[PDB]
């Protein structure tokens, strides 16, 4: 809620990703903080399994509701940190509610 980036580059969303879709490359931020310099997802390798969001210890990466993001180019479906953060800043009003509804089960 403070706007602070929630990922910390613990690098297990890619440990468990059974498609090897996720890459991370991490550094200190010059504030003195464990944060990423890279978060890519080849969404042409993702199988939409949810393991990354049930492995993240901080609820940083999620798998949201949008199923209407078809494209006319392969290169558009290869995401990076900025696209994922755009998605988050777009879909927070939905994802927060979905999480509020589904927790106490997970």
């Amino acid at each position: 809620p403070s706007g602070e980036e929630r990922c910390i580059a613990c690098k297990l969303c890619e440990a468990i990703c059974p498609a090897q879709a996720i890459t991370i490359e991490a550094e200190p931020r010059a504030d003195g903080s464990r944060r990423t310099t890279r978060y890519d997802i080849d969404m042409t390798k993702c199988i939409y399994c949810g393991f990354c969001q049930e492995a993240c210890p901080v609820d940083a990466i999620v798998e949201g509701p949008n199923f209407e993001f078809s494209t006319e180019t392969h290169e558009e479906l290869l995401y990076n940190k900025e696209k994922l953060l755009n998605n988050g800043d777009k879909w927070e009003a939905e994802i927060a509610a979905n999480i509020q509804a589904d927790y106490l089960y997970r």
Binding site: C10, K11, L12, R34, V58
Partner: protein, 688 residues
């Protein structure tokens, strides 16, 4: 005999007295869990995780510290010991903070894996944890002490191996805080080893901070090239990069320990580096060009010249394959000016008789000694692990060290025998105070560095030392196989050079200033364009343009030790094989590959075309080099002595101070080291 029959889960095993339960079980295969005992450090039973029941005794015993008694059955997988381990893990993880995704020892934590095997899966802890003030040691060791388990595996290292005694424990109870009571830079040449010692991530490395994770990392077993110790090493990569360095385990060298350079100097392999062949244009400026252009320039100039007007300087971070290739390529244009940056006297046997420029004892042989005599060395700040074995011997086999040089901290008391090389003659006479001590000794070893031989009296110093040494063997009849004279180097590419037939020094080049120079990895500042002919052609085959590249008319980008399979002979003479971990960048290539290509561009076309062929050529020249890890026993020191007593060069009335005197001078002695942010940070810390 002096043996003991002991049983381990019934199974019998024969062990000496003075052993323990952990070692008895290791002889079977079981390793007992542990957080305090290391196998190289003093025992301190402070974790209480090495607890096993004995078949009928009423309680459990520390398996790291309890010596084993005749007629015992060690029950490792019994419910008593498992209950003990579960409780100990409960207590350890009670106040431990939930920082596993932050913590850089995340998939490398002994606490994790021991909780996963030998521990429960639940916390019955419903109270508030603690949180400890953190300490700002220095630019390397990143202390987060909210997670230290108070195992004291670090104070013991710093006191017994680094010889520092600036690390302890303050207070008692949960409030005991490991570290200094003050702000103090724990800044030693063996300081990054605590990062491997601390099983917990209470202290990690700052360069590796937050970068990668252990499962991501591929691991290639290579060696070091900073010093001539030959410290075995693991280079860890991640998607074609280099992430960190780690030690390997070899007991004759790099006893699980490495210096701070070779684990905080990999930063230099990605800065001020050479990536393209660069040629000098009309305005007299370097410009990126192709390989064919540069090699054609070099070969065109090479066809003309023949003999004394073609030279070569191999310095530092150079292979043996490259040396052989350049050697053959200059022999086949009948030039013999194959030289190395660092002087070694040729006024006797010279580079003949390997025993004369070699650790004729072993680095393990220091354990089997009673007196050591250091000359012209600061072994702390050059070959630090040699000094570390000296201290290991100083502790566990009470050893008396001498020193001839300047008074400088070695991590131990060293019986300073003044500052002069006339004391060598004073000893060889038989009158010095030290001979009263040495006549009692039965296994001594003098060891002189290749830092006093850079002077203008190296040959005289060697003759004095050999004379003294032969009179020493005469005095104390030692053995038919014990070596006493030894030579310590500080350069990786020197022993292979002198083995193959390179002539140490530069003096032939000053004597016959050539119209060519090949300057192979020679980023030192010995030779300059102020000393060479007008219209000279210098080509630099290397990396890390520091001072040798800008003074060159063309450049041929080479590869680093991390990026080629090569051989580097250490001080002992042990040849050791690097393994390729990451390919070299840009249009950079291997050294011998470049020389063979230049040859084919010219008319020589050297016979070999692959790496096995060059290795067989090394076999032809010196067959000691294909013998990997197989140390070879030299001889014929008497011959060198008879052949060196002939020449008569006075020794100056000059003291001999080493170049690496303080730790300020240790962190930057190379190209990789000089182009590096971490070493510069350590210098900035020490000098401020």
């Amino acid at each position: 005999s002096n043996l003991i029959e002991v049983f381990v889960d019934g199974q019998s095993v024969m062990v000496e007295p003075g052993t323990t339960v952990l070692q008895a079980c290791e002889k079977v295969g079981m390793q007992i869990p542990r957080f305090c005992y290391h196998e190289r450090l003093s025992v301190a039973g402070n974790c209480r995780m090495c607890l096993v029941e004995i078949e009928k005794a009423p309680k459990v015993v520390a398996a790291c510290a309890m010596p084993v008694m005749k007629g015992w059955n060690i029950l490792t997988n019994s419910e008593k010991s498992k209950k003990a381990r579960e409780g100990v893990m409960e207590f350890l993880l009670a106040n431990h903070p939930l920082d596993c995704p932050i913590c850089d020892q995340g998939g490398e934590c002994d606490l994790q894996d021991q909780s996963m095997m030998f521990g429960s899966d639940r916390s019955r802890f419903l109270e508030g944890k603690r949180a400890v003030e953190d300490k700002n040691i220095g630019p390397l060791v990143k202390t987060i002490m909210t997670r230290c388990i108070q195992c004291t595996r670090c104070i013991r290292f710093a006191s017994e191996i680094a010889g520092v005694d600036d690390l302890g424990t303050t207070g008692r109870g949960n409030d005991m805080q490991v570290g200094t009571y003050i702000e103090k830079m724990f800044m030693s040449e063996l300081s990054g080893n605590v990062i491997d010692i601390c099983p917990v991530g209470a202290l990690t490395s700052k360069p590796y901070a937050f970068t990668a994770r252990p499962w991501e990392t591929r691991k290639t077993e290579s060696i070091d090239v900073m010093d001539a110790v030959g410290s075995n090493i693991v280079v860890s990569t991640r998607t074609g990069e280099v992430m960190r360095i780690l030690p390997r385990m070899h007991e004759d060298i790099n006893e699980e320990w490495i210096s701070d350079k070779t684990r905080f100097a990999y930063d230099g392999l990605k800065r001020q580096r050479l990536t393209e062949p660069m040629v000098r244009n009309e305005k007299g400026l370097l410009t990126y060009t192709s390989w064919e252009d540069a090699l054609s320039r070099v070969a065109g100039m090479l066809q003309n010249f023949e003999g004394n007007a073609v030279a070569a300087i191999a310095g530092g971070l150079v292979d043996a394959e490259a040396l052989v290739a350049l050697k053959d390529l200059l022999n086949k244009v009948d030039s013999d000016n194959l030289c190395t940056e660092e002087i070694f006297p040729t006024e006797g046997a010279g580079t003949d008789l390997r025993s004369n420029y070699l650790l004729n004892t072993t680095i393990a042989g220091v354990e089997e000694a009673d007196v050591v005599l250091l000359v012209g060395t600061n072994p702390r700040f050059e070959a630090p692990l040699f000094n570390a074995r000296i201290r290991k011997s100083w502790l566990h086999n009470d050893l008396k060290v001498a020193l001839i040089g300047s008074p400088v901290d070695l991590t131990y008391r060293y019986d300073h025998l003044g500052d002069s090389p006339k004391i060598l003659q004073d000893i060889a006479s038989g009158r010095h105070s030290f001979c009263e001590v040495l006549k009692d000794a039965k296994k001594p070893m003098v060891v002189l560095g290749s830092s006093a031989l850079q002077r203008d009296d190296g040959a005289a110093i060697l003759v004095a030392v050999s004379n003294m040494v032969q009179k020493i063997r005469v005095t104390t009849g030692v053995a038919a196989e014990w070596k006493v004279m030894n030579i310590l180097h500080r350069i990786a590419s020197q022993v292979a050079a002198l083995d193959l037939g390179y002539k140490p020094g530069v003096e032939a080049i000053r004597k016959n200033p050539p119209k060519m120079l090949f300057l192979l990895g020679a980023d030192g500042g010995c030779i300059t364009r102020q000393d060479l002919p007008k219209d000279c052609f210098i080509v630099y085959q290397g990396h890390h343009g520091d001072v040798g590249a800008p003074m060159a008319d063309v450049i041929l980008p080479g590869a680093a030790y991390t990026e080629k399979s090569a051989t580097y002979v250490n001080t002992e003479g042990r040849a050791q094989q690097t393994k390729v971990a990451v390919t070299p960048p840009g249009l950079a290539r291997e050294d011998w590959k470049i020389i063979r290509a230049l040859s084919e561009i010219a008319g020589i076309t050297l016979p070999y075309d692959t790496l096995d062929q060059v290795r067989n050529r090394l076999e032809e020249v010196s067959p000691n080099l294909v013998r990997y890890d197989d140390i070879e026993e030299t001889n014929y020191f008497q011959q060198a002595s008879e052949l060196a007593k002939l020449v008569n060069q006075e020794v100056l009335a000059d003291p001999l101070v080493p170049p690496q005197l303080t730790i300020k001078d240790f962190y930057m002695t190379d190209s990789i080291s000089r182009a590096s942010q971490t070493m510069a940070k350590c210098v900035k810390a020490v000098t401020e």
